[PDB]
Design an enzyme around this catalytic site. Structure first.
Site, mmCIF file in Angstrom:
data_model
loop_
_atom_site.group_PDB
_atom_site.id
_atom_site.type_symbol
_atom_site.label_atom_id
_atom_site.label_comp_id
_atom_site.label_asym_id
_atom_site.label_seq_id
_atom_site.Cartn_x
_atom_site.Cartn_y
_atom_site.Cartn_z
ATOM 1 N N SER A 197 4.837 4.086 -6.435
ATOM 2 C CA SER A 197 6.095 3.409 -6.766
ATOM 3 C C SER A 197 6.295 3.458 -8.282
ATOM 4 C CB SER A 197 6.086 2.002 -6.161
ATOM 5 O OG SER A 197 7.368 1.429 -6.313
ATOM 6 N N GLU A 324 10.796 3.720 3.606
ATOM 7 C CA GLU A 324 10.663 3.195 2.251
ATOM 8 C C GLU A 324 11.542 1.970 2.019
ATOM 9 O OE1 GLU A 324 8.458 3.977 0.108
ATOM 10 O OE2 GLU A 324 7.924 6.096 0.209
ATOM 11 N N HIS A 437 6.799 0.910 2.453
ATOM 12 C CA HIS A 437 6.545 1.159 1.042
ATOM 13 C C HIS A 437 5.248 0.484 0.617
ATOM 14 C CE1 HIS A 437 7.763 2.083 -3.111
ATOM 15 N NE2 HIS A 437 7.554 0.821 -3.444
#
Ligand SMILES: *[C@@H]1O[C@H](CO)[C@@H](O[C@@H]2O[C@H](CO)[C@@H](O)[C@H](O)[C@H]2NC(C)=O)[C@H](O)[C@H]1NC(C)=O
Ligand SMILES: *[C@@H]1O[C@H](CO)[C@@H](O[C@@H]2O[C@H](CO)[C@@H](O)[C@H](O)[C@H]2NC(C)=O)[C@H](O)[C@H]1NC(C)=O
Ligand SMILES: *[C@@H]1O[C@H](CO[C@@H]2O[C@@H](C)[C@@H](O)[C@@H](O)[C@@H]2O)[C@@H](O)[C@H](O)[C@H]1NC(C)=O
Ligand SMILES: *[C@@H]1O[C@H](CO[C@@H]2O[C@@H](C)[C@@H](O)[C@@H](O)[C@@H]2O)[C@@H](O)[C@H](O)[C@H]1NC(C)=O
Ligand code: NAG
Ligand code: NAG
Ligand code: FWN
Ligand code: FWN
Ligand code: CA
Ligand code: CA
Ligand code: ZN
Ligand code: ZN
Lengths: 532, 532
Positions: A197, A324, A437
């Protein structure tokens, strides 16, 4: 003995820790910079003054000052990402796991945590380096860096709050690893940086930044890339937000100097409590204080750098997860719930679309809506839910990463792309959230090798697979075993754009990751917004 | 005897013609207006001065002056649409088929030929009314009207070339049927107008026009509706084109009067030879002289009329063919051929998109391209070919008709919608062209009942089916047989939007005809063009 090591900055003492039937050395909490405290708040980091005596490297350091997620108290799914140490502005430390016996000159991997540049910690259970250092014989480092306003308040033109200091914190740790990792059995010529990320975007940003390129050999980006719409702001917008932060705290705004003095005199928590107010829009997947396109750390715009090949040319391995968007929808969009299937009404779909693409004008919102609405079935609540997941995922992670991978591959020395789509058996989040995610990290760090975590046998197999991919790529620049009967992970090429599924089933090869939607997000929508 | 009939305008003598083992009366070439010749060129029609003696109604009349299609000489596929009589400005005549013996007061059907308002003839083999009059016991009328500049040159504000005179020609024939069809065994209270392409748009335009609404009972529209992008122009654009026609012929342009005098002194063929030069764009499915939104024949804009319910409220039956675009692509777009599969290259796809949406700016062309391009397979020549077919079909026929049907159904008294997708066994066009624009007409008129035409048995069955649908709808306002074991054709409703397949297989019910693409064409693209 192994646990005592000398470094150009001082002596360090570590602990022997157990891991899976055996042991390795851990060096926890080594300092790489002066504490960025008092009048150094918002300043570039300075290097750690060398110390007399042995530095006790036996326990995890403090975590940096950050917003703490309390939307689901007493729920392990959220609290596994919160700080698990005391928070402090005195937080620029790194951790090292070293195999036992100590290797002579082996591969080094440096982890850069994510968290939207507003949160994160090197000390999270899920980032425990020991299982990777042990199972693959690598020196595993995890660094830390300032987040939120402390790391990214940007008053471009000032020397006391110039922006990107959080990224400079990361560089200085990379510099310290560079000058000192030999003493731990580490080869400074074979450093792989990796991160998820905002940590993945950070990696890409060091690939781009001239001042960082010499400090590592190759790179792994997980669900993040430097061009993500949330990962940077213009100099003008960073200044706007910094001034608005002061405005929120009743500061003198007449000048950078007065503004910064006021902000330096506030307690950490008073900055954190108004952090979210500076965002220009009601939104999700948008964070207040992020890297700034300054002309120094980044000499020109990211796109112009990517087009001209102005970046470190080496091998990269990178990929995304299947779902995600769901994390951010759950936290910030109407109609979503941790306690139900979250069927989304047409009315809530429209609200979600506006939160997900907050910079879009109304014509842009219609374009997004049409691209993602099944007009044979526009009231199907499950299709709306899944459509928002794809919108958030495609716009914020997958399509920016696909744009980066296509631009990078023109000049790089080798690309490997994955699509992680395994939903862990023991996931504590509800089923509609899918492959969330951040939830490949536990496989990269070997957590399914621990039986007290009750993963399945197939999941341990996938973790060993992934760890061997990641570690082999770090050592050779290629994740494939040199002469194996096992299916090869093909290079991603400009022409055929191949990638693999990462899951418990036998590896499959695909091409052109979500190519249809990424044309929408990478070519058409920007063109529509520039015209209207 | 049957073949001698008196009318409010004069006496008429017809012929007994054979049809399928039996006979009926035909009255060919009855005049309904003064010859629009000499100084009446471009003027509204005046009614036919009554005549002494018997009018010989034994043979087909002249066809109106028109552009003739010669792109494929000696090829029946194209020449079946060319005039098959001598062309003349003296062309305002109608034909009537009457069953034998003469019915007392039975249903009347009036055919309005298509041809883009620039061509067409009531006398084409394929429009031969005898098979329908005979098999279903109806008085079948086919009218005629001026096309091209002769029927639609529009100098709004002039009394000598006001526009829409071709539509007024059609009204006057409808008026003549109204005052005179009793004498032929026809019920003037039960007149159904029907028509294909520009004839279908014409029908919708009489539904809308106050001056026409009383002249018929209900209506059938085939692959055409009044709001089609090619079926009308603004007053300003009609004036622009009329002036440009004069400019092409070296006319005095100082005034309407001088312009019209010059144009009235040219031979028909000199007008026809420059007809296409007045189009503002290189394009396909665009025609020079069409109905004009004048404020008289149409009191306001078509959309405002459709929104407010300002139209004749009755029953309508209407539909489209599966491959509406292929005819126009073959004639006007690069890469298409009558002699090959016409795989379309990316370069030719882009050219085709611009020809098909000529009014679109570049952002609009990108939007069309993205909506119709498979980016997993952008070089597939067959997908490009089929994509252009859908673009032309959706933009020019299907989506405007779907917009009309949804607007009409809010106020009407009953809607039936079909999707014709049978490819005739004996089609002379190549296979990639599919179910071509215009090729349901031969089934509506019963041509497969003739064995010398070598249709299959299933095709004769479908023709009888279609003819009985069309004729029953004309008599009752409902195509379904009153109490049959046969599957019903359901009403199209605002809420469920049902329609049927018309083919040789057992009828199937579907919903929301091409709803996804028609949102693009009816809502999004117009919004994008208004903003940019
Ligand atoms: C990465 O760079 C290396 C070194 O420049 C490339 O290898 C050379 O490739 C050329 C052309 O194929 C050969 O003529 C040389 O003999 C190679 N040298 C060595 C030392 O192997 C390599 O092909 C590049 N890989 C990618 C994926 O770009
Ligand atoms: C078409 O119009 C007719 C007449 O107005 C409608 O029929 C009437 O419908 C109402 C409400 O259902 C009844 O109360 C009357 O008894 C009906 N009258 C007759 C003479 O049948 C008819 O429903 C309309 N059809 C459509 C599809 O709109
Ligand atoms: C090194 O540190 C070990 C553990 O330390 C603990 O953390 C510090 C911050 C204090 O809170 C201390 O009270 C804790 O025990 C010690 O057990 C060990 O003895 C230390 N080594 C030396 C040489 O001092
Ligand atoms: C009616 O017309 C029949 C066929 O007419 C033909 O067309 C006209 C225009 C002329 O070209 C003529 O030479 C053609 O034969 C005639 O056979 C028939 O006799 C006519 N009826 C009367 C009463 O005159
Ligand atoms: C599964 O792991 C949890 C901790 O995550 C542990 O408390 C539990 O005891 C394990 N399962 C069993 C059956 O013990
Ligand atoms: C089929 O119809 C054509 C005319 O369209 C005719 O010439 C031909 O003779 C027919 N078929 C046969 C086998 O005769
Ligand atoms: C107003 C505060 O909003 C907090 C939004 O949190 C965004 C990140 O959510 C996902 C956390 O793992
Ligand atoms: C320049 C002349 O272009 C003629 C175009 O013809 C359009 C109609 O084509 C289909 C005819 O059935
Ligand atoms: Ca999903
Ligand atoms: Ca088609
Ligand atoms: Zn002070
Ligand atoms: Zn004259």
């Amino acid at each position: 003995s192994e646990l005592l090591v000398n470094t150009k900055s001082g002596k360090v003492m570590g602990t022997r820790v157990p891991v899976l039937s055996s042991h390795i050395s851990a060096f926890l909490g080594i300092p790489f910079a002066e504490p960025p405290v008092g009048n150094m708040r918002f300043r570039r980091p300075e290097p750690k003054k060398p110390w007399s005596g042995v530095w006790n490297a036996s326990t995890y350091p403090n975590n940096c000052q950050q917003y703490v997620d309390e939307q689901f108290p007493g729920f392990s799914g959220s609290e596994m990402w919160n700080p698990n140490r005391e928070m402090s502005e005195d937080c620029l430390y790194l951790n090292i796991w070293v195999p036992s016996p100590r290797p002579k000159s082996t591969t080094v991997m440096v982890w850069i945590y994510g968290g939207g540049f507003y949160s994160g910690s090197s000390t999270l259970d899920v980032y425990n380096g020991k299982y990777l250092a042990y199972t693959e014989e690598v020196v595993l480092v995890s660094l830390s860096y300032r987040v939120g306003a402390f790391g990214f308040l940007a008053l471009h033109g000032s020397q006391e709050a110039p922006g990107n200091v959080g990224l400079l914190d990361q560089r200085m740790a990379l510099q310290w690893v560079h000058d000192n990792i030999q003493f731990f059995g580490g080869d400074p010529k074979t450093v792989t940086i990796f991160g998820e990320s905002a940590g993945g975007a950070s990696v890409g940003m060091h690939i781009l930044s001239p001042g960082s390129r010499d400090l590592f050999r190759r790179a792994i980006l997980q669900s993040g890339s430097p061009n993500c719409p949330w990962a940077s702001v213009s100099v003008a917008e960073g200044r706007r937000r910094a001034v608005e932060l002061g405005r929120n705290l009743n500061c003198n705004l007449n000048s950078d100097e007065e503004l910064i003095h006021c902000l330096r005199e506030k307690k950490p928590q008073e900055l954190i409590d108004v952090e979210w107010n500076v965002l220009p829009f009601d939104s999700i997947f948008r964070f207040s204080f992020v890297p700034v396109i300054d002309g120094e750390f980044f000499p020109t715009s990211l796109e112009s750098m990517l087009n001209s090949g102005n970046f470190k040319k080496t091998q990269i391995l990178l990929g995304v997860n299947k779902d995600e968007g769901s994390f951010f929808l759950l936290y910030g969009a109407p109609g979503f719930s941790k306690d139900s299937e979250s069927k989304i009404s047409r009315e809530d779909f429209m609200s979600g679309v506006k939160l997900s693409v907050p910079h879009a004008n109304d014509l842009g919102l219609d374009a997004v809506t049409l691209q993602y609405t099944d007009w044979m079935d526009d009231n199907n609540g499950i299709k709306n839910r899944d459509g928002l997941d794809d919108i958030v995922g495609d716009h914020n992670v997958i399509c920016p990463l696909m744009h980066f991978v296509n631009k990078y591959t023109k000049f790089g020395n080798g690309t490997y792309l994955y699509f992680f789509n395994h939903r862990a058996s023991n996931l504590v989040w509800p089923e509609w959230m899918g492959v969330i995610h951040g939830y490949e990290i536990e496989f990269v760090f070997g957590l399914p090798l621990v039986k007290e975590l009750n993963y399945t046998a197939e999941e341990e197999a996938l973790s060993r697979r992934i760890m061997h991919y990641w570690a082999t790529f770090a050592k050779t620049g290629n994740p494939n075993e040199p002469h194996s009967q096992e299916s090869k992970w093909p290079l991603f090429t400009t022409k055929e754009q191949k990638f693999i599924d990462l899951n418990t089933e036998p590896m499959k090869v695909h091409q052109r990751l979500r190519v249809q939607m990424c044309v929408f997000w990478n070519q058409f929508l920007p063109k529509l917004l520039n015209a209207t």
